[model samples]
Target: GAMDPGQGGGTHSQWNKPSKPKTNMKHMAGAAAAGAVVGGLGGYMLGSAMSRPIIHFGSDYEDRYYRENMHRYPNQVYYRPMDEYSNQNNFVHDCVNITIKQHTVTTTTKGENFTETDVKMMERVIEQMCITQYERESQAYYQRGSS
Candidate 1:
């Protein structure tokens, strides 16, 4: 025969009466923290991919592609002038003119001669490799977060 506090109706039980929803501040905070972690990881992956060099060459291309293309693909070039460059005036005079000699790694299945498109495809593959490296790093970061 107990009356409900709000409606004074026996039809509604005291336990069934509507009440304000409980706010779990700790749960909210935890959700926000998890969101931040996810967002930061996504941002880092995008930023790293953007920052990585699309084109990469061996040590031989240091002078040819790097130094020469400094104004062109600045991001693609790795600058290590100190180790690579020496005093041209010296008698030893930096005879180490680094030339990136193109060596064929594998023969084409199509048996067609290497064309400009083939070179472009090779460059694209190098870019894809860079992206793959970035993805690996991003995955590492994600694993660290989970741990």
Candidate 2:
């Protein structure tokens, strides 16, 4: 009795009327800012902000794919965004996002303490393994917002 479903308010179920769907974007974005989160794939076009079209990769096979019967490879996100250039055809705009992180490391040939330049090096080796977990999280985070 409080409202009608005709004004794009909602729909009425066979047995009852649906309540208004209420969600404040400020609250949702604020929640996402504070919370952990995680994308859909299907060779479907995904877009980014301000109509900056996501570089539709693997989906858009340029003039070369016609060489074979149809596809040169499987449908993948073949092209991704990046910054760089190349006169060589394949050397530039490479989509594989492999970034080299340089770090100075201590090493040795024998014994538990031998491998460590500092007393803490032994402890760090284990944490190094666990730190890899964040790589998965970062992937999900990027896909959620950018993919």
Candidate 3:
């Protein structure tokens, strides 16, 4: 029997032996359970938030416009030529392009020589294509989430 020098074996009974292992296990199990519950709730909230449309009153209108129309006026084409120049020049070129796109009402660059009616029809088609793509992606996202 393990005996203490100051306290006799009778004074320190078997019941007085440290119960640290059991206490630690109970605390660890409780912590793990709480962590799991919190993790599940956090994941659910995040998933719900992502599935919902991000809203904006005024500032987001511009974001939506760009998201909606960026393909129509691709900036990637303009950036390609800048790679031939120095990095600084490339940066300047990109900044200038952004400014022009942001402030200029009409673009000097033309995609193709087309009549007004043709341009309008192209816009309609692009809109429809974007809508179809968004619908497909939304459906896919939710379906995948559920699975």
Candidate 4:
């Protein structure tokens, strides 16, 4: 038997290795879009927007103790400006309703970009409006009652 040497090209198995980490570009683009959204929120500080800040009030000190102790202090005056303000001259009282003995100042267009200063300042403005309004209407109510 004669030994024959074979020289056919051996199988040169090759693999593509780690092809491409193409996700890098996508991640970077995602981060950029996220940053753009955050930046837009910062600009909202400039202009004003509409927001309702409800103002609720009560003479807690007086109502709580006074109502309970009313009988004991029967002779004591029930000095309630609220009662005097609404004397049957009824017409909704221009947002001032003391029927429940509670007052609520409606939302002011002052600033919806609410801040501490806005709250404090708007409170003062609302106070003035309420006081002035009630006083004028109270007098009118008294006049009407006098009639």
Candidate 5:
């Protein structure tokens, strides 16, 4: 034989074959279910944490003060101009007191801390809340009592 059949033929059985598809759809379904569970839980927590209404200083006090004192100081004339002062500056003192009371009440109820900006804002809120309340009561009196 010419050169002892220089090299033997390799077996084709040893050749690489195409890989089988990694089609484990049950695991895929489980993965999707777990993802949905986690995602839904996370979404619920996020919504719950942020769903509260924005804080305002006036709602509870407005009705209470109106009910109690609308009979006594039932007109806008009862309140001084925001800039005006009494001989003893009594109105101004009352404003300051109410402002302080609002701050304490707000901090205790809402667990909110008032900064310098918030303090200033609270003064305006009181003016709007308290002053406007007086005005509305006065309007009611004027509309009814005057006529």
Candidate 6:
């Protein structure tokens, strides 16, 4: 005569029931699956954006980065120095008609742009020239020692 409840032979108070083990497991599985999907997508984007080489363009970055890493002993490999007056720079200009002090390398693109190909070429040529002289001199020195 206290209260009317649904047809169940268990405890009258619903708050006294055992905890829901299956429900907790289902919720945990769902959370893990969602996390896996998100991680997969994030990983792909990060990988694609970083696959190719990227240049860190800046004022001091050019000089500090290129100079310290410039290889002089091997001479088998080379790169252009960031210094405008570097031997490689002089060599590149030497290969061209423009005088650094008096003339400019004419470019057709608006607002002074270098085509990607030429820019890469200049950098490669500069680097090659940078090591060519030093390494050759080293070889000559060692060759004399061997004899």
Q: How do the predictions measure up, each by TM-score?
A: 0.22, 0.15, 0.23, 0.24, 0.31, 0.22
Score each candidate by Cα lDDT: 0.32, 0.26, 0.32, 0.31, 0.37, 0.32
Off by over 4 Å in 5: 1-93, 145-147
Residue 58 displacement (Å), model 6: 27
Residue runs of model 3 more than 4 Å from their true location after superposition: 1-111, 145-147
Span of ten consecutive residues with least summed lDDT in model 3? 30-39
Clash pairs, candidate 5, are none
Using TM-score as the measure, which candidate wins?
5
lDDT of 6 by residue, 21-101 (tens): 553333332111100001122111110111111234454634543332232112222223234455634644443321111
Tens digits of per-residue lDDT for model 5 on 1-147? Answer: 365545566655566777877755453321111000011111111101111112244556544333222222211112343455454345544544443453445454565444554454445444444444344445766887421
Better of 4 and 6 by lDDT: 6
Highest lDDT against the true fold, candidate: 5
- Please give, for residues 1-147, the per-residue lDDT of candidate 3 as tens digits: 997668445445356555554333333321111000011211111111121222233445345333333334321111222124545344343444332332232332232233443344334333333233334445767888321
- lDDT-sorted candidate list, best first: 5, 6, 3, 1, 4, 2
Q: Give the lDDT of residue 22 in candidate 2.
A: 78
List the candidates ranked by TM-score, beginning with the highest: 5, 4, 3, 1, 6, 2
List clashing residue pairs in candidate 4: none
Clashes found in each candidate (C-alpha, N, C closer than 3 A): 0, 1, 0, 0, 0, 3
Q: Which 10 consecutive residues of model 6 have the lowest summed lDDT?
A: 42-51
Clashing pairs in 2: 58-78
**lDDT-superior candidate, 3 or 5:** 5
For candidate 2, write residues 6-60 as lDDT tens digits.
Answer: 5446656576677888776553321111110112222322122111111222333
Q: Give me candidate 1's TM-score against the actual structure.
A: 0.22
